């Protein structure tokens, strides 16, 4: 038993986008799918439905005239076309069919903009860091898109009081994303810290390695 | 799905939720309830309360006005209603019950006293007696053999015997026991509180062998002549020998019935085994194991089972069948094995619906018939629904939990009240046992007294509307009926509500016969259908439509299915009184019947209105079926508004049967239901509005409706009780 | 279009406390009602369909039931793999019920950090404050420049729970062009939280070291 999510992706605004969801394991002919989508932090949103059984379709209404959805029993196959994209619709949709199965969702980016590789700078732990306490330090990946950054610690073998945030995006439609580590303070003059960060839309790696500033 | 529900509180037609002749006898029921069949032909129904003090008796056919006994027990049963018997010796009902102290209390109720007026009884109608020790070797199981002779079960695994000398006295008979002796292996204790394979169904055969099963599933068999063990098969060495749990059975509960020499057996794999062999000579021979068709976990126990001669079913290919009624919290279900051959190696699994029309319609709105509008109005909707008997319990419950009603208005309490009435009524139907009413007639008792659940079986139709989501197959009419839901599912009440009336306002003229069909058609569509459709499905029905030949369905449809047919009496057999009982069942079926015929007609109706269909042609349909619809709504606006009343107009219709019916098959009833639907689309209408004349707000719809010159009489009359009034 | 209301939006408990998370329709659906429960990052699984009927193969301490236009999931005893967001439905869902596995109050740990040289380089300046290891959820920044008040000026993120000790971090930046940041001295971030008797500030003076 699986559903099955292709064709999502970046879209340009006002473009197109044809979702695929390929079913097995039950009987497609006599199921309901349905399109349900989520957008970044916000709950779900049951768009629209068809019956395999007789065609029979419905939309809600944020979505009426501008997606289609349909189906071919002979493949065990469903659609969703997407005209006139619009950033409120952005998100990761699904596809259930009645909703006991569930597709692993893809995701739909709507806008614009380049492929654009981070810049990395330190965040450098405080010359007031505690005597015997525990200082912060970090790196700041700044302004890249699209997602994803994944960033490690001295190759990976730091990963005890290690955070790395949920990237934000700012007003640019470049975004940005912090990771840190917390050490003890005795540690800042004898122990190297690494931060690895790797974005692969744009094949850069970046190591960068934070330390105390000097004045 | 075969069979659909109908469900039956004895007492809906009445005001008082209880019987005025009740009568408490007293020793010096919400926990089990089963039915008996009597020499008198009548069936006594009587319940165990929760905590085993109490034991009520009531006639099933005249729960009302009958007399309702409820004895009261010194102390609670020792294990439940399994420590209790109930058979019919001569003219009198005998019930023997082990106490929790020990005592055997025997009860003698005359027959006579069970269908009398009187609020006394005379004579030594109970009699004290303690046998045996059973303080130290604790009983748990009572099965009755004989007017004289009857075993008793202990949780250490003993037998006793339990032999009548005179009318009173009883004497243990032990049996020769040497299971004991696997206390000597490592692994057993006598000591131990675990270990005890004890005994968890029995089974009389031919008077004479005792077929027992344990809770290691063993089937044990004692020959009652000699008093010796005969047999002892392991029910689990045979299937799949799993390892890593078989499920001792933790309780005893009905895992066994027998037939003629059959015998099924229920094993617990995921909850999942029906063995069933042979017994002859004294041997037991496997045939086969009939795994379940369960899932969501498989979390059903099983509640009854009867195994039994065959129904008519849906498949000929049939030899005997098993019904089967599980549950899970409140909710039940019901089932049939059917076995086709003497060979019990080709099977099939019937199921059921196990929620009734009514609750189904609630549940998933799709009642468009009930009046809307006042909050009081929605008060008389629901009083009507349920009966006196849910509805003030329900009126209880909410006055315990303070919550009372503010106002007049008060929204936010009617809609407390839907799901009190609901739960209130999902847990009196709680199932209990399986009682074949007549021959073959499926009946479920409930644990509320007056409240038992028939399983019916469908016709045609029935069967359509019941399995639109699903039916593989199907002749044509079964198609284009599904496609004609498949579009009218889309549509909303309110719009589904507009249009039933506008068919209702052709007839009533609210539409003047002026106007040709196409003009009322055009105006029933711009007023009620325009913008109110997706057209992608408008698309979809008309070309799934374009499939059928229209005419030869609907002729079948209407001709055969629909309309009923002429009978020349059909032996239906005349009732000498009345049966409050089968009153109901009718009634609710018909009901039933008569909802799902209203639906198709609606749906047809629907798709003359939106398509270019000759109107000339189809004018014979057309007018038919307006017809029908118009009777159907009728019907089922009277129903909900006054049943007692109904019922009483609907059997003082048919004169040879104005008392009523008895139906012993299935073919019987399904042939009086018919009946009664003949008689609606055919004296009820005259004889329902006079006797409730001599249901206000109800008949000013029923006069707009119901009424197309005695029809603006009634108007006038009603509407005084005033311009209107006076002018019309 | 209906309207499924839930309460509360938040809540938070005990291992083996009873949960319960209510459901109000805003118009009368009937008990076509179903339950789920959403993990972060993958789909839902449904939990209970008609209202309380128990969905195969879910634990049967998770429970559904009616009253009125009330629906309510109940947990009977919670445990430590149930954090998730829960979501009642009808199609429209219910905005979501978030639960975690409550514990004590923890105090954040702060530290600010002025931008880099490199940076002011590019014509911006983000200033930032970390508030580290604190319960609950609920802490408040306020960004002060010379003692001034800020607003709609500042972003912040929060990471999810703490798989050992439960507990969340917070960051904070606010953004300035370099000129504006040139044009004051003290920069300051003001942490308000149940777990700080008092409200902690950490600042700096621009170009001090």
């Known amino acids: 038993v699986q559903l099955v999510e292709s064709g999502g992706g970046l879209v340009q605004p006002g473009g197109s986008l044809r979702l695929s969801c390929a079913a097995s394991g039950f009987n497609f002919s006599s199921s309901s799918i349905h399109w349900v989508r989520q957008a970044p932090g916000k709950g779900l949103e049951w768009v629209a439905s068809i019956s395999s059984y007789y065609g029979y379709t419905s939309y809600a209404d944020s979505v009426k005239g501008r997606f289609t959805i349909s189906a071919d029993t002979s493949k ?91 990237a934000v ?47 | 799905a075969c069979l659909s529900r109908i469900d039956a509180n004895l007492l809906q037609y009445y005001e008082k939720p209880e019987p005025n002749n009740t009568v408490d006898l007293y020793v010096s029921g919400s926990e089990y309830s089963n039915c008996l069949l009597l020499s008198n032909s009548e069936y006594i129904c009587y319940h165990f309360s929760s905590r085993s003090t109490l034991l009520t008796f009531y006639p099933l056919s005249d729960a009302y006005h009958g007399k309702t006994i409820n004895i009261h027990l010194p102390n609670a049963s ?54 045996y020790d059973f303080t130290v070797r604790v009983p748990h199981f009572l099965f009755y053999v004989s007017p004289q002779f009857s075993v008793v079960f202990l949780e250490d695994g003993g037998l006793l015997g339990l032999k009548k ?101 229920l094993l617990p794999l995921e909850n999942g085994l029906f063995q069933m062999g042979t017994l002859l000579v004294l041997t037991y021979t496997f045939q086969n194991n009939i795994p379940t068709n369960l899932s969501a976990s498989a979390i059903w126990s099983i509640v009854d089972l009867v195994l039994t001669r065959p129904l008519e079913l849906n498949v000929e290919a049939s030899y005997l069948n098993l019904i089967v009624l599980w549950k899970s919290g409140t909710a039940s279900k019901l089932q049939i094995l059917n076995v086709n051959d003497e060979s019990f190696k080709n099977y099939e699994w019937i199921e059921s619906v196990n929620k009734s029309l009514v609750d189904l319609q609630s549940e998933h709105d799709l009642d468009i018939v009930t009046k809307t509008g006042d909050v009081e109005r929605g008060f008389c909707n629901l009083k009507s629904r349920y009966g006196t008997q849910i509805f003030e319990r329900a009126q209880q419950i909410l006055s315990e939990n303070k919550i009372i009603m503010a106002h007049n208005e008060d929204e936010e309490y009617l809609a407390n009240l839907e799901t009190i ?62 496609t004609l839901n498949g579009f009218a599912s889309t549509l909303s009440n309110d719009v589904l509500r507009s249009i039933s009336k506008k068919f209702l306002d052709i007839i009533t003229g609210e539409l003047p ?33 374009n499939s059928f030949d229209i005419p030869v369905v609907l002729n079948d449809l209407i001709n055969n299915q629909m309309k009923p047919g002429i009978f020349w009496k059909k032996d239906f057999i005349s009732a000498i ?30 798709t003359f209105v939106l398509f270019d269909l000759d109107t000339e042609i189809f004018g014979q349909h057309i007018s038919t079926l307006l017809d029908l619809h118009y009777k159907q709504f009728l019907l089922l606006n009277l129903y909900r508004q006054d049943k007692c009343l109904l019922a009483e107009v609907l059997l003082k219709d048919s004169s040879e049967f104005s008392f009523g019916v008895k139906f012993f098959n299935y073919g019987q009833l399904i042939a009086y239901i018919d009946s009664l639907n003949s008689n609606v689309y055919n004296t009820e209408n005259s004889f329902f509005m006079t006797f409730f004349r001599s249901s206000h707000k109800n008949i000013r719809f029923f006069l707009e409706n119901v009424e197309c010159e005695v029809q603006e009489f009634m108007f006038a009359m009603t509407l005084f009780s005033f311009d209107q009034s006076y002018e019309i | 279009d209906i309207q499924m209301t839930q309460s509360p939006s938040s809540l938070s408990a005990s291992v083996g406390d009873r949960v319960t998370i209510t459901c109000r329709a805003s118009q009368s659906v009937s ?52 954090f998730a967001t829960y979501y009642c439905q009808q199609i429209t869902f219910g905005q979501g019920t978030k639960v975690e596995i409550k514990r004590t109050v923890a105090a954040p740990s702060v530290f600010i950090f002025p931008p880099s040289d490199s940076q002011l380089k590019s014509g911006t300046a983000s200033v930032v404050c970390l508030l580290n290891n604190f319960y609950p959820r609920e802490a408040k920044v306020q960004w002060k420049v010379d003692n001034a008040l800020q607003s709609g000026n500042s972003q912040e993120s929060v990471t999810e729970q703490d798989s050992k000790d439960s507990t969340y971090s917070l960051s904070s930046t606010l953004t300035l062009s370099k000129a504006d940041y040139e044009k004051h001295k003290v920069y300051a971030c003001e942490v308000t939280h149940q777990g700080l008797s008092s409200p902690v500030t950490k600042s700096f003076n621009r170009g001090e070291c």
């Not at chain 2, 499926?442 to 079986?457: A, D, G, R, W």
């Open chain 1, 76 to 166: 065990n196959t469903a659609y969703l076309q997407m005209n006139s994209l619009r950033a409120e619709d952005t998100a990761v949709y699904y596809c259930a069919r009645y909703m006991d199965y569930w597709g692993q969702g893809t995701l739909v980016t709507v806008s614009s903009a380049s492929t654009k590789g981070p810049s990395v700078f330190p965040l450098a732990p405080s010359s007031k860091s505690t005597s015997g306490g525990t200082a912060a330090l970090g790196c700041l990946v700044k302004d890249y898109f699209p997602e994803p950054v994944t960033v490690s610690w001295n190759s990976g073998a730091l990963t005890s009081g290690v955070h790395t945030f949920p």
């Open chain 1, 169 to 215: 995006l700012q007003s640019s439609g470049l975004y940005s994303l912090s990771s840190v580590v917390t050490v003890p303070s005795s540690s800042l003059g004898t122990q190297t810290y690494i931060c690895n960060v790797n974005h692969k839309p744009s094949n850069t790696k970046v190591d960068k390695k934070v330390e105390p500033k000097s004045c």
């Open chain 2, 78 to 131: 020792m294990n439940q209603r399994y420590t209790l018997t109930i058979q019919e010796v001569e003219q009198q009902l005998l019930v023997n019950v082990i106490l929790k102290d020990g005592s055997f209390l025997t009860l003698q109720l005359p027959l006579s006293f069970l269908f009398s007026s009187a609020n006394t009884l005379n004579g030594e109608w109970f009699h004290l007696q303690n046998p």
């Open chain 2, 165 to 265: 000398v005179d009318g009173v006295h009883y004497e243990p008979l032990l049996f020769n026991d040497n299971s004991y002796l696997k206390s000597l292996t490592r692994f057993f204790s006598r000591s131990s509180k675990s270990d005890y394979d004890s005994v968890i169904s029995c089974k009389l055969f031919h008077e004479r062998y005792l077929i027992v099963l344990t809770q290691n599933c063993h089937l044990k068999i004692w020959d009652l002549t000699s008093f010796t063990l005969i047999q002892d098969y392991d029910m689990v060495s045979q299937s799949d020998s799993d390892p890593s749990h078989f499920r001792k059975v933790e309780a005893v509960g009905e895992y066994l019935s027998l037939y003629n020499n059959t015998l099924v057996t």
């Open chain 2, 421 to 482: 009435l609901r739960d209130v009524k999902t847990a009196f139907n709680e199932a209990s046992s399986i009682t074949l009413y007549g021959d073959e007639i499926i009946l479920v008792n409930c644990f509320q007294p007056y409240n038992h659940s028939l399983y019916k079986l469908n016709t045609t139709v029935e069967n359509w509307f019941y399995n639109m989501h699903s039916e593989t197959d199907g002749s044509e009419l079964f198609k284009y009926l599904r």
């Open chain 2, 513 to 545: 016969d002026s106007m040709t069909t196409v003009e009322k058609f055009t105006d029933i569509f711009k007023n009620c259908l325009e913008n109110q459709f997706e057209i992608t499905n408008l698309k979809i029905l008309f070309d799934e439509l």
């Open chain 2, 577 to 606: 009184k009345f049966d409050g009982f089968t009153s109901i069942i009718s009634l609710e079926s018909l009901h039933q019947l008569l909802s799902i015929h209203y639906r198709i007609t609606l749906q047809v109706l629907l």
């Open chain 3, 31 to 82: 008990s076509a009602v179903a339950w789920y429960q959403q993990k972060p990052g993958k789909a839902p699984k449904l939990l209970i369909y008609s209202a309380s009927s128990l969905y195969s193969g879910v634990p049967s301490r998770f429970s559904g039931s009616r009253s009125g236009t009330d629906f309510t999931l109940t947990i009977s005893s919670l445990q430590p793999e149930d």
